[PDB]
Every structure is written in structure tokens, then in C-alpha cells.
Structure 1
């Protein structure tokens, strides 16, 4: 099955998931000079005050911090979005080295990592239905650079030892995702896809311009995770990012001048 290795990595995915070569695949390079300011973009609304985290899971390709999405608690709206999108999970993609790891790039620049806060459109009732719709998901993407520590990330970092291998989970309640956001909510937005198989073309991407800073020690602990299950040969969970895909017939819009 698919992964990020030499023989099952992104260049292989199209054989099982032909949509890999589709018309609105993600991630993409964000050419900042070609992106156009769109004054019709409403302000972005991130309402995470009632967020209820439940669990953190190593799923063999990343780790997911999962939320209770059975009520409108933590929601994303405004910006390019019509209606209300409910937070279901967040996860990261990261590199083996600080110079790579992000999925989106900015004028071909790669960041050390990228945070994805995944939301689904409540008009479709559940997440499984939402991924079958062109406007089913909204993913808020946030770049990570290495510098000062992000205090709000440390609780995530310290539980990773308990979910080292594929299929392990741990209770992870009362985590506040507001601690992972940068100061500015300036963003780029474009229509795209899941960046992992099945690569469904159901995502409105909202990528923040301002990165957050995390420490070398924090990202080093990401890199101690395992792709493998317990009692299997160790393969470090690093470079779990898909590279930039062709933009094709799409325009990236900016929320800012």
C-alpha cells in the first residue's frame, strides 16, 4: 500500500488512485506574485473556544489530534467559505531536515513542516459524505519554521513517545488548538484535494501567509515517530509530504494586498 518510500511514494500513487493526475490536486506552489488580491473575500472566522480534543493517533503516515465533531463546537467560516465547517482533526507533515517538510511551497520555498487543521462542511452531515463533495472540506494550512519554541505545541510533542508506532493512540483531552495559530490570519486560497490517498478533490484550501516558529527540539521529536507498527523494523516517520502538483486551470487568491 501507499506511503512515502521509494517504491510506494507520491510518484506511485496514481496507479491505485488515478485522480492523482487530476485537475485540482494538492499541494501546489504558491507563486506570491501571481496570486491576486480578492477584495470580495470575507474575513476568516476561526472559532475554536469550545473545541473538544479527544485523542491522538499514529495512523502510519502522520499523527492526528482528533476532536468531537458531533456538535458545532470548533468551526471555521467566512473567508472563501459558504456555511459552517467543523474541525475534525489536525495533523502535520514534516521533513528529515529543516529545509524540507511542507507540502505547499511559497515561491518554491519549502518550510520545515506544515500543519493541517481539517474541517468538514456541516451541510453534508458527516465527514464521509463531505469528502465526496467539491466543497466538502476546508483545510487550514499553517507553515512551521524552526526558530523559537511554540509553547502551545509542547503538549503535543510530549505525548508522542506514547504513540511511537502505527496504530497506537492515547487520550488527548483539553488541548487548545488556538495555541498553534500565528498572529495574522492573512491567507491564500484555492480549490484542491486531499494530499494523501484517496486524493479526493473536495478541499477548499486556506493557507496562512504567516508561519509559526517551533524549536529544533520540538521538530526533532516529530522525527522520532515511526511509520512502522510495534515489533517491526524501525522506519522513522520523516518526509511524509507530497510535493507540489501542477496548478493547471486554477487561480490562487490572496486575502491581503
Structure 2
């Protein structure tokens, strides 16, 4: 029902999701002259088990890679967190051209895409459903993707898209550690925010990597060739799924560096 087209897009989400106009909405423009270095931030620690990788799904507006989350095989710790967060999913956002596509921006610069690695607070809550609406419920790592050299670490993900071309298609997607997609440096910014699409819950502690990762023009073309329509309908390419940046409304972006 909600989407990214003119009628059902970001500008219209506030009609059924009034939190769209809230005080902790994501994404944001990170102004580096306004970040506050925080001495208490610990290094980010990711430990993911490739056997937790489950399924790749065409969800119409995007594609998701889902992980088994019945236990602490795949966790995020450190950074601003006291709690351990359990991996559940990673996905991407992209734009209609190389010029835009990231959700977060840095000093107003727009990258070509962004990787989200999402986790839920299994220290406090017993399920993703319980965690998702809680202020301390979710932790998402964002990595800005800069158009340039082809990124070989995307190969398994890109190779899998031919089997989920249309909306609702899904396939097994196994034996994959998404920490291989992260940049060498885990230097980061953090700020309290939200899911970047409906239902836009203000439940996310964002970890934005300072270092970008690469993606080629042709790798981005593979994302944009995914189809939003169900099989047999006329083809409607997934051209974009990035939400514009939202007002900080007095929030502080902290730097680990």
C-alpha cells in the first residue's frame, strides 16, 4: 500500500503513519562539524555465524536477506550498547541513478546506495515482534555505498536475485556471513532514530560507518532490474527505495573517532 512512487511515497507516509513527522526520524544528514566525539563508545563487535543465513525475499519495494534468530549465533555488541543484539536481516537501498540512492548523507553528500544490517535486543526482549516498537529495541548498521569498482563481496547476493525477480518470490540463501560486506574500519557515528520506512518506529540505534564500501554502476543496475510487480503482470522495475533525510530536531550525532 505504502511505497516510493509519487502517490504512496515518503511525502504521503504521514497519513497512516503520523510518526513520519516525529522527533527521532531517519535517515539524517550527518554534519561532521556538529558531531560530538564520545570517549565512552566502545568498538563495534560483530560475530555472525554463516549457518544463520535463511532466505532471500522480493518484498516488492526491496529485497531482504533473513537470518534465523532463535539464539545468539549471530550478534552485535559494543559501540553504545550494554546489551547484545541478534542479527535478523540485511537489505539495501538505492536510487534511480548513481547520483543518489543512500538514505544517510554526510555533509550533504549523497552516495549511490546503502547497506542496512538489522538486529534486535535479545538481552531485554524475547522476540523481534516485542523489540521492534521499543526505544532500545533495534540496532541497524548502515554502510554508505560509493559508486566505483565492482564489489566482489556482493557476488552471492547479486547471483541470488535471478531467482526472486518478482514480488513475493523467495529462495533459500544459506552459509553467508554479512560481516564480509562491512568496511575494514568500523569507526562510526551513532544517533537515536527510526526505521526508514513504514511502520517508521522510533526504535533504532543507528551505527553509521565512516568508511564507504564500493559498488559498480552495473551492480546497481542489478538492484534496479528487480521487479516490484507479481509474475505475469507488466514489468515495473524497482528504480529507487531511499527516503529523504529528516530533521534532527535537537538530536546529537556521536562519533567513535
- TM-score normalised by the shorter chain: which range applies? over 0.9
Bigger shift: residues 85-94 or 211-220: 211-220
Unpaired segments of 5 or more residues in structure 1?
none
Which residue of 1 is the match for residue 7 of structure 2? 7
Matching residue of 1:184: 185
* Cross-structure match for 2:84: 84
1:50-199 matches, within 5 Å, as: 52-122=52-122, 123-199=124-200
Distance between the aligned counterparts of 2:153 and 2:69, measured in 1?
22
Q: Give the secondary structure class of the aligned counterpart of 1:102.
A: coil
Q: Distance in 1 between matches of 2:249 and 2:90?
A: 28
Contact 1:51/1:74 (8 A) holds in 2: no
- Aligned positions, number: 256
State whether residues 50 and 175 of structure 2, in contact with CA within 8 Å, keep that contact through their aligned partners in structure 1.
no
Q: Provide Cα deviations, 1:164-222, integer angstroms capped at 9, x if missing partner.
A: 11101011111121220111000000000001101001000000010101222211111
TM-score, normalised to structure 2's length?
0.97
Between the aligned partners of 1:109 and 1:194, the Cα distance in structure 2 is 21
Alignment partner of 1:221: what SS? helix
> Which 4+ runs in 1 deviate beyond 3 A?
none
2:11 match: secondary structure: coil
State TM-score, norm by structure 1.
Answer: 0.97
Alpha-carbon distance in structure 1 between the residues aligned to 2:129 and 2:74: 18
Work out the CA distance in 2 between the residues paired with 1:110 and 1:197: 22
In 2: Cα distance, 1:83 partner to 1:124 partner: 11
Q: Is the 8 A contact 1:103 1:114 kept in 2?
A: yes
Q: CA RMSD in A?
A: 1.0
Do the aligned residues in 1 keep the contact of 2:51 with 2:174 (CA within 8 Å)?
no
Provide the residue aligned with 1:220 in structure 2: 221
CA contact (8 A) 1:153 1:179 kept: no
Q: Helix, strand or coil for the counterpart of 1:158?
A: helix
User: How far 1:51 sits from its partner (Å)?
Assistant: 5.2
Is residue 211 of structure 2 the alignment partner of residue 210 of structure 1?
Answer: yes
